[PDB]
Design brief:
Four copies of one chain form a homotetramer. In chain A, the strands form two sheets. Chain A has an eight-stranded parallel beta barrel with strand order 1-2-3-6-7-8-9-10, surrounded by seven helices. A two-stranded antiparallel sheet of chain A has the order 4-5. Chain A is built from twelve helices and ten strands. In chain A, β6, α7 and β7 form a beta-alpha-beta unit. Chain A is of the alpha/beta class and about 350 residues long. The first copy, chain A, has a single domain, classed as TIM Barrel (Alpha-Beta Barrel), CATH 3.20.20.70. At the A-D interface, α1 and α8 of A face α1 and α8 of D. The PDB classes it as lyase.
Chain lengths: ~350, ~350, ~350, ~350
């Protein structure tokens, strides 16, 4: 094959520097990019009307927590709406995030769509006009992006088509992002839905990630200028067999070691349906796993960082401090976890 | 694998019926889906302001040509704007087309975009919200669609990435169309640009089509409910070697016989940069080629059907009949050509 | 994206001419390339010792049938041993076959091997030194070759790996053959084992054939100089739902129309476990299917042509004529079937109605 | 999307343990699996008859070097003939190797064959009956195998077909080996022939390795029980532009970091046409490269370990010691190099890639 450089040494340096800042030691990502329709259920759980002002206030609550969170948060992912909102002091949210040492991220996908001829499988859309959108988001303060692909473990899934198609679209998205100085976070989420066991999740995860990286290679993606946001390897949500955190950690680390090139700057785990504590304990076990890990192993949590804060807030302005306190607590717990320093108080078998 | 029927028997019948109607014996397609920007150059060549009214009048001029074009035109591809315009008498253009026995088509792609890391190669965008658009277009009169992918022959092109990506996006577009009762015309155009010879075009065409059909299979596409719009196999525009129309025909038919499944309902050739007469003479030779052809071999011409008509019109309403006469003559010529009855006045070597 | 011609116009012409001769109108293939281990069970069924002489005698019985079979047989596939054996008159079997207007074929694969990490799936070996073997076989009379890949329909099969690997090895085999003037018969057999229905077999067959032709394209195979030997599309041998011959024909022709390029010279169906009569009736229905079929649709039968003959012989040299007559009868039936002109309504032994199905061990 | 375990935990443990022993800190591989026809050139350069006895004497010369090579040699690749020969004392060569702490390897491919429709490209044969051959070799003392695929950088190569086909055959070979307790060394050699520069080699190497590992994944290969034998990333032999060892090391390590999963136990570099000293300097530079390397980076040298020994020997029994001393010196040098501790004296912008 013949090379036709997609990026200059300068463009590579910019992307690599951004990627490294996000996952620097002890730092993780706050995923606060829920759309109106996705955060609707959260607000209704606390009897709070889903208005623009309430969403702005809640986001402000998280983004303006005290400096204790600064060394814990390397990046914050925002939804389009939030990227253009301002704190009470008039400061745009991207400025608020940057001022606390964090990198600003932006969700750019346009949701999943059904793959015809499959058993309920999907791919993700959002490539149309993505380059122009990225160029604008960059000018407006964003340095990295989010794009979520969803795969499911079932009797006949994920199918060959679902794997190939989702891997290909993630590569297209990544390619467009890098052309605009935006670090793409590649997110091939394999849902925990089902009664499958740990070994099954590990197998599927290994096959999906192998497909993802081959696609990234085919599309000339600069891995040093990317991050990976995969599901941890865990048994199905309804699996009858139970496992220890150490087992989940070994399965996860083994899967990654068998598929993720050392060149990838970092892995930022999604928490799925895990509770706040569960997500932190598992991430800690992952970092304590006695196998060599050539990439940062950290977090990109949404609910796992906001669950208690949202509840403490309750939609009441007078609970601002209490709510932010809960967020800080989880930010500190996960910052410790991504270093293997968190305390709540036979690899050949994989 | 396991079958999860993308289409029901009823949906298949609808698509197959539409596809067969468009390429019925003696019929072809008038490709009049030029956008404001793509038609600008041609309107300029005749010193005519590029306004919606002049565009409507020009399209009206073609769509309302006399009844002689009825048995020649099986389908008419329109640009979005035109699908919603009406003739002077108040009849919506789709109605005008149908009343003359033609099927209405709609361009649904959103143009080409550059593929990073390649030598000026592209893929095509337009998948976002495509399903909803197809459902709307279907309700508004369209029964088939157009989506153009572009490949170029050069020292290092078309590359593996370009072939794979364009084939994959064509399959996604095809799948979405069929879910909405729209027959997708798969258009993997290989540009005639360059000094390459006939055998090189044939080789590249064979490899591209093989990739296209494997992708359609992977995406569970119903071939009987599709049409193919490929380039004819010809030498590059700058090639110094000369060839007869019979050689062009043999190379073209051999390439198709080696890659296009019999199930494909029809092949509607694009004319590229060929003149009106050249496009007709070649299509005629293709249909007279001794080899067995299991699919209709017809036309989907834009410039090859409008060149003389546009010039005769010159933006002058008083030239209406003169302009239509030119279009009618090419429609008649190509109807004869797709039957191997048009007259202006060693196969192992492939 | 650059062409480096694998074959010259002359080489292409030779391959195309051979392929067309094999499937010329009314003609089919006699698959008599069974190995010693396979023919042994056949000879045992009739209390006949499995010796080289008995095997030679049996093949001679089929190859020397009267001239009525000449118009019916376009090609005969032989096992290595048989290619070098001679009839009682001293004539090498290849010469015997050729003198009757038939093309000589040779089995070149070395059997199936297990694909690790799969649920009992396999791929096929035999590429090592294949070029030299083909060159020698060509000199010794063979003009086409046989190579069998095997796939099975189940809950997890055929898997992505099984399909990809088998399609790739078939392509390598085809490439090497064409470099030596040998027409390769591409055989991706999907076993009838299981209780799946007609539509499931059709689905799998379509996916497998799509993979096969994409691989052939990737390996620069000259399709006009090849033949395809696929399973007919039918329900699983244990399927409860019953189907008519017309439905089997429609499903078969539809699957082929959706995957096999018109350039492929011909399709020579394997009979699987179908009885002699069933194989003839289905082949006939296929040729009568209303859909457009741009390739010859004929047969490449082994057991489906030999069942009655093997029984009539019984290992007794005295039953020579009797046995050959049964073979000639099936050859004539299939010759008419591959033309859509076969109509039973007559004297067809019960042996021709017996299921020739054998579970994959 | 369903797993059907190709290997049990015990089988995986055996393969992983073998792989790790071969590339343990400070150890590399002596590649002495040259066939009769291949070793013919070497013997003629020193005017020595190519007989089984001469080949045995030469192989014995390398295999029986003094104990100084023990901590340097983790594995020795033998040709079929040699696996069944014996030292003067009657000890089978596999026993001699094992007694010195080395693992015994065996070449199992049957050479390259031309890929029709390509510009002189090839694939490699040898899968037929490979399982039976592996079981027999395992029984006779071998624990790992060698299989060489060859690709070339040219105007239109390596082509898509060549890359896909060689990657697929390497996967089949690896799969069969692992079923028989044999650790397969995956060798996708990209020849240094041509005038291409360093970045072109790096590009091609990256694309080839990506295809190789995708194939291994598709074939369910246990990476921890495998080793990789790639070309170092270097400019073509006819390249007019010159590069330092640091640049060669950066390009090489960068290419590997972008394609080789950390699960792969080790990388054993082939030296190609590099001189003995050059091969050691580059390997040392590779190990000193300031980037994270999650796998052992060592050697699997043939000529780079035998060049001087062959010449010193000259086919004269009286030169045994002199010849063995040359081999020992290169074994020691490379042992230091695969630790980044090599020095001529003896025992004493990354974004632009």
């Amino acid at each position: 094959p013949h090379s036709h450089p997609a990026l200059t040494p300068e463009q590579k340096k910019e992307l690599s520097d951004i990627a490294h800042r996000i996952v620097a030691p002890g730092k993780g990502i706050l995923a606060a990019s829920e759309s109106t329709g996705s955060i609707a259920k959260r607000l209704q759980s606390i009897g709070t009307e889903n208005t623009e002002e309430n969403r702005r206030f809640y986001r402000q609550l998280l983004l303006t927590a005290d400096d204790r969170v600064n060394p814990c948060i390397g990046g914050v992912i925002l939804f389009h709406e939030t990227l253009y909102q301002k704190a009470d002091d008039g400061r745009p949210f991207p400025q608020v995030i940057k001022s606390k040492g964090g990198v600003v991220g932006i969700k750019v996908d346009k949701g999943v769509v059904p793959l015809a001829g499959t058993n309920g499988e999907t791919t993700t859309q959002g490539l149309d006009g993505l380059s122009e959108r990225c160029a604008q988001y960059k000018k407006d303060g964003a340095d990295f992006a989010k794009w979520r692909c969803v795969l499911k473990i079932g009797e006949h899934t994920p199918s060959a088509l679902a794997i190939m198609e989702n891997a290909n679209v993630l590569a297209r998205y990544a390619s467009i992002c890098q052309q605009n100085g935006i670090v793409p976070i590649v997110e091939p989420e394999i849902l925990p839905d089902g009664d499958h066991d740990l070994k099954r999740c590990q197998y599927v995860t290994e096959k999906v990630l192998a497909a993802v990286y081959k696609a990234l290679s085919d599309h000339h993606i600069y891995l040093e200028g990317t991050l990976l946001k995969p599901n941890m390897v865990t048994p199905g949500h309804a699996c009858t067999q139970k496992y220890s955190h150490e087992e989940i950690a070994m399965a996860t680390v083994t899967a990654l070691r068998r598929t993720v090139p050392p060149a990838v700057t970092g892995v930022t785990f999604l928490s799925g349906g895990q509770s706040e504590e569960e997500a932190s304990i598992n991430l800690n076990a992952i970092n304590k796993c006695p196998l060599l890990k050539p990439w940062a192993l950290t977090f990109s949590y949404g609910r796992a960082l906001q669950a208690s804060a949202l509840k403490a807030w309750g939609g009441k302005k007078e609970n601002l401090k209490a709510a932010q306190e809960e967020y800080v607590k989880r930010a500190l717990a996960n910052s410790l976890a991504c270093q293997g320093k968190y305390t709540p108080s036979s690899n050949h078998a994989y």
